[PDB]
Design a protein around this ligand. Sequence first.
Ligand SMILES: C[C@]12CC[C@H](O)C[C@H]1CC[C@@H]1[C@@H]2C[C@@H](O)[C@]2(C)[C@@H](C3=CC(=O)OC3)CC[C@]12O
Length: 157
Amino acid sequence: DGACPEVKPVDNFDWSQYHGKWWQVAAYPDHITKYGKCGWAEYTPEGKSVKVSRYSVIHGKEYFSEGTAYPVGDSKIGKIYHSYTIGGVTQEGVFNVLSTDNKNYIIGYFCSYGHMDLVWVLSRSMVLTGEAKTAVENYLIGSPVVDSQKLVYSDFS
Ligand SMILES: C[C@]12CC[C@H](O)C[C@H]1CC[C@@H]1[C@@H]2C[C@@H](O)[C@]2(C)[C@@H](C3=CC(=O)OC3)CC[C@]12O
């Protein structure tokens, strides 16, 4: 119960880091079930947009999905639009970046109407270690909205 909490996205997001391979190292279970396990995505800059090609295993079957990403308003604010096309159905939406160091990791959040929350953590490496791990932990302890106990970490074995 409750409406979506008011989110305070970052003020320093660097869109130039939005390229290359990002591994989805953690997420809430509902996200893993809906959008799949073993998730990774390749981001390819195309002018003002970035193209997103994503792999995951959904209900035991592998899929690639495709989407386009654009910043909404000032790119520094970390409010990002993605379209998301899989199995011939397109969806679209806006999510907010809760935390990033503009180098190793990004934490994304989406909330819809009661209300359901989804959080996912992306990294340039398959495993969150050192610097990135420490930043993520500190963020979680002060975070008004992410429940750290609910995160499930990925097993890329
Ligand atoms: C914002 C979004 C838009 C489509 C749908 O409404 C669901 C929401 C929440 C979930 C969100 C999609 C867009 C998608 O592109 C995502 C960002 C997608 C991911 C891409 C990625 O690198 O990590 C996750 C899986 C699902 C996703 O996390």
